[PDB]
Amino acid sequence: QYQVGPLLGSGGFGSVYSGIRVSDNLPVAIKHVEKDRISDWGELRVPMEVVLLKKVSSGFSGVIRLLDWFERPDSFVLILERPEPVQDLFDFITERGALQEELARSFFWQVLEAVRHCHNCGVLHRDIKDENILIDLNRGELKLIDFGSGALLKDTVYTDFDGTRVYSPPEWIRYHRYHGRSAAVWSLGILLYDMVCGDIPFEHDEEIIRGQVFFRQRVSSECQHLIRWCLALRPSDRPTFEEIQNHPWMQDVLLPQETAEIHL
Numbered sequence: 001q002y003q004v005g006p007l008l009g010s011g012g013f014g015s016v017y018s019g020i021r022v023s024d025n026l027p028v029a030i031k032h033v034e035k036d037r038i039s040d041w042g043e044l045r046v047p048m049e050v051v052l053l054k055k056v057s058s059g060f061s062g063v064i065r066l067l068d069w070f071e072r073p074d075s076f077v078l079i080l081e082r083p084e085p086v087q088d089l090f091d092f093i094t095e096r097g098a099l100q101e102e103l104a105r106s107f108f109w110q111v112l113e114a115v116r117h118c119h120n121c122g123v124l125h126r127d128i129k130d131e132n133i134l135i136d137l138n139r140g141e142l143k144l145i146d147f148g149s150g151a152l153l154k155d156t157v158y159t160d161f162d163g164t165r166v167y168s169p170p171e172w173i174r175y176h177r178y179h180g181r182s183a184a185v186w187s188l189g190i191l192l193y194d195m196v197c198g199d200i201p202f203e204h205d206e207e208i209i210r211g212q213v214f215f216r217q218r219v220s221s222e223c224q225h226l227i228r229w230c231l232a233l234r235p236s237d238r239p240t241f242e243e244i245q246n247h248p249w250m251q252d253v254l255l256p257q258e259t260a261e262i263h264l
């Protein structure tokens with residue numbers, strides 16, 4: 001039913017391959033998830049990732065859609081949308097360096113819309129970062145991938161975390177506790193810094209806990225202010241998604257197709 005192409009990436013979780021749906025030639029990604037490396041299971045018994053993707057794969061959005069899934073004795077196999085041509089945001093930033101603010105604004109806006117969609121669907125991603133964002137290069141559209149560390153959104157504290165440390169908030173580093181929305185906004189602050197500076201702002205636990213943001217590239221005062229707000233040490237000091245999107249730096253965003261024409 002699927003023609004398997006080259007390996008795209010792998011880890012302890014499993015492995016992801018480029019692929020083609022035989023019936024209509026649709027480009028897909030084929031993600032193999034090892035049963036013994038799934039720490040969080042859900043019910044419809046499946047990986048939480050399948051639960052989460054089904055909850056958000058309803059309709060159009062800036063989330064990669066789950067097309068089908070299969071169970072094997074030792075693994076699940078997930079069939080996911082694959083834009084072509086595509087580049088992840090990490091590779092994009094590696095190649096082009098720090099992004100022009102106009103471009104970072106368009107990208108960051110689309111990520112915000114995607115994350116709002118997840119939260120509105122009861123889903124918390126928990127690993128928002130450049131590597132988990134795909135750019136549909138023809139359309140200038142961004143897509144969130146990899147819900148393998150995610151969880152149902154709740155209003156009470158989380159005490160588990162298996163996303164990316166350097167994108168994790170100081171409350172996690174110190175007390176191994178965080179709330180969903182405010183932890184997400186922290187990771188968004190790390191992401192926006194990464195876009196406009198070309199690298200993440202903190203490498204060690206001590207820098208995260210200190211929370212002093214040093215800008216290594218020229219960044220406008222308005223952008224710096226948004227970033228520093230997202231990276232407030234006190235979780236409750238961080239902006240809501242609404243406050244982020246109403247921030248003066250976020251005004252007059254380019255459309256995705258204009259973004260493609262101008263920058264891609």
Ligand SMILES: COc1ccc2c(c1CN1CCNCC1)O/C(=C\c1n[nH]c3ccccc13)C2=O
Pocket residue numbers: 008009010011016028029031064080081082083086088131132134145146147
């Ligand atoms: C270590 O590599 C991983 C790990 C988890 C996932 C994954 C990959 C492959 N690459 C790794 C580098 N950044 C982009 C994704 O791709 C996923 C989903 C995809 N859905 N559609 C795609 C289309 C192209 C590439 C990846 C995907 C994952 O969940």
